[PDB]
Amino acid sequence: MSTQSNRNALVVAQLKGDFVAFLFVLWKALNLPVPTKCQIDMAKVLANGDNKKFILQAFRGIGKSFITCAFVVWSLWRDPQLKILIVSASKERADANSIFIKNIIDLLPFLSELKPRPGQRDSVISFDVGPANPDHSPSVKSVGITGQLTGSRADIIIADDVEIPSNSATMGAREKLWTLVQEFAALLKPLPSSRVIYLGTPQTEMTLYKELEDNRGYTTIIWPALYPRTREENLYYSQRLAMLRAEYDENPEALAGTPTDPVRFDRDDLRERELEYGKAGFTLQFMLNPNLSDAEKYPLRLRDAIVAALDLEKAMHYQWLPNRQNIIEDLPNVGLKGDDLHTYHDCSNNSGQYQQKILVIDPSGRGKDETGYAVLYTLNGYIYLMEAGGFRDGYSDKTLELLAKKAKQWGVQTVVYESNFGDGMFGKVFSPILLKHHNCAMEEIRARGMKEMRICDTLEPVMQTHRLVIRDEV
Amino acid sequence: MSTQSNRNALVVAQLKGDFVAFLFVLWKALNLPVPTKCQIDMAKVLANGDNKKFILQAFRGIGKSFITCAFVVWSLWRDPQLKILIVSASKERADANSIFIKNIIDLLPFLSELKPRPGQRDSVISFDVGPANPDHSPSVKSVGITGQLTGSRADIIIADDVEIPSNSATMGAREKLWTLVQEFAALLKPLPSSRVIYLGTPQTEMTLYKELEDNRGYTTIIWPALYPRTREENLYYSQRLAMLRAEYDENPEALAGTPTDPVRFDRDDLRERELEYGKAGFTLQFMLNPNLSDAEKYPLRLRDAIVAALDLEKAMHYQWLPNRQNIIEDLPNVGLKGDDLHTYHDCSNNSGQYQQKILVIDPSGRGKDETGYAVLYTLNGYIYLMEAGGFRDGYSDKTLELLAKKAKQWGVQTVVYESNFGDGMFGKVFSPILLKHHNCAMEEIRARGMKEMRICDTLEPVMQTHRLVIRDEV
Secondary structure, eight states: OHHHHHHHHHTOHHHHHHHTOOOOBTTTBSOOOOOOHHHHHHHHHSBTTBOSEEEEEOOSSSOHHHHHHHHHHHHHHTSSSOOEEEEEESSTHHHHHHHHHHHHHTTSOTTTOOOOSOBSGGGOSOBSOSSSSOEEEEEETTTTTHHHHHOSSEEEEEEETTTSOTTHHHHHHHHHHHHSSSHHHHHHTTOOOOOEEEEEOOBTBSHHHHHHHHHHTTOOOOOOOSTTSGGGGBOTTSOBOOOHHHHHHHTTSOTTHHHHTTTOOOTTSOSOSSOHHHHTTOOOOOOOOOSSSEEESSOOOTTOOEEEEEBOOOOOOOEEEEEEEOSSSSEEEEEEEEESOOOSSSSHHHHHHHHHHHTTSOOEEEEESHHHHHHHHHTSSSSSSOOSOEEOSSSSOSSEEOOSTHHHHHHHHHHHHHHHTTSEEOOOSHHHHHHTSEEEETTEEEEOTTOOOHHHHHHHHHHHHHHSTTTTTO | OHHHHHHHHHTOHHHHHHHTOOOOBTTTBSOOOOOOHHHHHHHHHSBTTBOSEEEEEOOSSSOHHHHHHHHHHHHHHTSSSOOEEEEEESSTHHHHHHHHHHHHHTTSOTTTOOOOSOBSGGGOSOBSOSSSSOEEEEEETTTTTHHHHHOSSEEEEEEETTTSOTTHHHHHHHHHHHHSSSHHHHHHTTOOOOOEEEEEOOBTBSHHHHHHHHHHTTOOOOOOOSTTSGGGGBOTTSOBOOOHHHHHHHTTSOTTHHHHTTTOOOTTSOSOSSOHHHHTTOOOOOOOOOSSSEEESSOOOTTOOEEEEEBOOOOOOOEEEEEEEOSSSSEEEEEEEEESOOOSSSSHHHHHHHHHHHTTSOOEEEEESHHHHHHHHHTSSSSSSOOSOEEOSSSSOSSEEOOSTHHHHHHHHHHHHHHHTTSEEOOOSHHHHHHTSEEEETTEEEEOTTOOOHHHHHHHHHHHHHHSTTTTTO
16 A cells, blocks of 8 residues: 555646645644645645756745745655755745745655755755665755766756846856756666756846846746635635735735735836837738728739738737738738638638739738638638638648647747848738737737737747748748 | 697787796896886787787887887787798897897797797798798898888888988888788688787887878877886886986986987977977957856857867866867857866856857867866756757767777877868967977877876867867858
8 A cells, every 4th residue: 555655746746736745733733734726736836747947937925934944855755766956046935945845845755755964964954865865955055066077967947036146147157058959868777766857037128038038039938926725715704706816915015015925927028029119110001891800001013922821819809910921031811811800610610712813822820720621621622711821830720739838839929020120021910919918928928808819829829830841931 | 738729829819928938038038028018018919909000109218129029929929820020120239129029939838839840941041931831030121111122911011210311211111002901801800810910119200200190190009118117117226216317318318318328218309298389379369257257259250150179177277267269160269167166066067058158159168077078967958957969979978078098189189280281270379388388298198297187188178079070061
């Protein structure tokens, strides 16, 4: 039984965390820690099974340390007779983190508890020093670069409040070899958990903004905000209000302090994917649309190559079809179809086709959503309209498969580049207005309350398509 | 037992040499010869398992004969009922060599000792004459060309003090057929050990300089110097000083005599790979580098092909990125990145990429060292930055595999040619200054004490790449 249970905890962190990690209460004695949805999400994200490198952009006044401690415990307690854990922090701050990890360890049952060799010996700063084997060492990040290089067979690095470590660039550079091509690859094959976990609240457009952006440009992990603490979701009268805790917290303080403390927003910038510095320069071309939702910016020309992207409307929002002049070095948007009048799942393929045909048999890349897959078939070369210029990443998927997060991520990342470096020129008014509100929805981007992102999202498909080798001359 | 031990000695020369080769001392009787690290290295290098043709550039006052004798013994004693051994030498000198080989043979136990048919009979100059079968014949090299041609079923040729044999060109030409395409190939298949071993101290830029250079241009074998005699490493007070033996030896004589006797340096030349005759003509273009370590000599031009080589810094030294204009018949160096500020294993790939992209999507050949393999991945077409112009010799190795000595050897050899024949033009000041000190580190080249070779070593990658067929139009 013991072997099965130990192994169970070993590869199911959530179960281990919910069952064995305790706090010792004064009224109820040793009780189970009541994990929160954000903490549970964070535990899953930090595991050998999933990735290796994780970065959290969290707000302040979230009991993050409670989870970080449970993870670090779980790591050392279930390591394959191996592994050194070190943290980078300017304080005593890293000592506080390991204290909590020790608070977790000390409450474990015998069978899950490895024997303790060292434990804050000499009033440090360290547990399980020397072979035993796993260890956790609290370190100042200000010293290390020294801490990173000096470590012998490092397995995990946790970096507390990474955004508030001054002169981090050298310490960060020291980290690169430890993770990036890389003893990390070699240790991961051995099943060496560890790994790099960074968690902290933002601090302007410093080094961390670069870390978060590079991560978010590729993935959408991870960020929780004041709302993650569900106790705040109930007012003084003990009724759910999703509203007053925020009002009360805004008062007895400041709005500038509330974004600083409970929002994890970066200072010197809005959320928007496209910088306002660029959204201000963007001019449009006003045009009167057809009976359908077509806006013609520049008419089709013979011997010009066009590309079309289509983000169909599942139900809420609109169908968005951009047509982009691909001929020259600078891609211009020459025509857009924007409509929510399509009550029929059914008459769009023909309507879209005449614009695709109008633009020199324009190849089209359709977002494969419920309606998408759909419209795919009707305008397929084989399905109904026999249109031979429908782009597909596979034969099962007659367009852009939206499975796996990455396509949208890099599609947004390439979007940003294309629009900002002025490789792609947008003419549609409603286009740029959607960009105005297509901002951070950590860990991705979306349209804020009461706005649509249909136009922007179908340009995201173009952005993703932009990366593709086949696109390098459709 | 005897069969196993005999066979053991047969294919483990070091073991045979350490266990059975003796000297007979006056105070301790028959004792084992105490092999030295240089002698051990030399024994390994002369074996059927390894090569066939070996050349040693040794200093004088090294007991080389002690090893040469042990090898020649081992050859004849463990030949497959075969093999004639002859040496080329102007003396009685070759007679002295075989005397020592006889001194080794005579001390062997019965089971390792083959029966002696002839043994200095008629006051020669020969042992084991006629079928028996193996034999060793002391010969003057001055006569042979006669000695080489006249031999019947020669198996090994050892050439004593090859650098001091006058009118060797004819004797050398006689040797060519015996080794080079070649009865040697045919005898090696039979398991015929032998083979050609040349050992001697240098004597200016004669025929031997050509032999050593041709060998060193391809391989890095073999050379030991006064320091190989570890007794010299301890002073009068019997304390290790790695310093005074050399001082004492420089005194009671001359510095010109010490390079002549204990250094194995060639007279009419410095160590440098590039001749000073060429290093004097080399002009540079002074430029102010970027925030990074980029020096731009000539800006990128449309429709010009560029090549980039990158030797990453493991820890000590610098990261070196040359960019070479490959368009014309004469390759010019148009830009160099030289930095040791990269504390991050981690931000280099992006920085390098912008220069590669700046130079018309410049393909790059990265040295696969710990950091290399690394930077490889991040700028890989698949790994992180998705750069599609990263040269690789394999799919596992995303650049220049530094395994096996040969790449560096021929890379240096091609370097030398490119720079001297003026096919490659170097503009960087620090480039040519590194060449100034990139000299003989037998059997290769490196940077002498307190100098860097990062810039030169990354040009070596270009030189090796220069040979590659794929390079003949990247």
